[PDB]
């Protein structure tokens, strides 16, 4: 009910409201994972909790979607690619959502969305997905909900 103005204005507050000193937070976390040739890597959920993301105070998180980009150049004569295999505590998926680059100098991107019925919390000991690529590193952007 208050805007404009150039000086302080009195607020007619009432009863003490419902408060929460540690609220939730919807985020997209950008971090990188190194990857080997012909070998899959399980991305740990623990990478999401860090002071570099203002999330070191959380212990759980609900992932919503994962997106992966190749972070380094591919091998000689090759185009970049990156695969994603979703992992769940109730049962690992066998999908391999793959995306390849059409220009050797361009990143390779791919992503997958977690359905509502599978959006449960994950802790640092859990894994998000498996990453396969010919590039030595892969950049990730995970849309999740810390709680």
Q: Contact positions toward Mg ion, by CB under 5 A?
A: 70, 74, 80, 103, 106, 108, 135
Name the pairing type of β-strands 109-113 and 25-34: unpaired
The Cα–Cα gap between 85 and 103 comes to 24
Instruction: Check residue 141 and report its DSSP letter.
Output: E
Using the rule CB under 7 A, is 2 a contact of RNA? yes
Of 16 and 38, which CB lies nearer to RNA in the complex structure? 16
Identified binder of a second copy from the candidate list 34, 36, 37, 65, rule CB under 8 A: 65
Q: Counting Cβ atoms within 10 Å, is residue 98 exposed (0-12), middle (13-18) or buried (19+)?
A: middle
* Binding to a second copy in span 68-97, by CB under 8 A: 68-69, 71-73, 76-79, 86, 88-97
Identified binder of a second copy from the candidate list 33, 35, 43, 58, rule CB under 8 A: 58
């Amino acid at each position: 009910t208050g805007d404009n103005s150039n000086v302080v204005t009195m607020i007619r507050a009432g009863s003490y409201p419902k408060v929460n000193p540690t609220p939730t937070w919807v985020r997209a976390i950008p971090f990188e994972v190194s990857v080997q040739s012909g070998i899959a890597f399980k991305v740990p959920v623990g990478s999401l909790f860090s002071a570099n993301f203002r999330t070191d105070s959380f212990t759980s998180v609900t992932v919503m979607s994962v997106r992966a980009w190749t972070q380094l150049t591919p091998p000689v004569n090759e185009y970049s690619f990156v695969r994603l295999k979703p992992l769940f505590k109730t049962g690992d998926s066998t999908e391999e959502f793959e995306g390849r680059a059409s220009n050797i100098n361009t990143r390779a991107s791919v992503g997958y969305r977690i359905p509502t019925n599978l959006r449960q919390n994950t802790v640092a000991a859990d894994n998000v997905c498996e990453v396969r690529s010919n590039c030595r590193q892969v950049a990730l952007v995970i849309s999740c909900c810390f709680n």
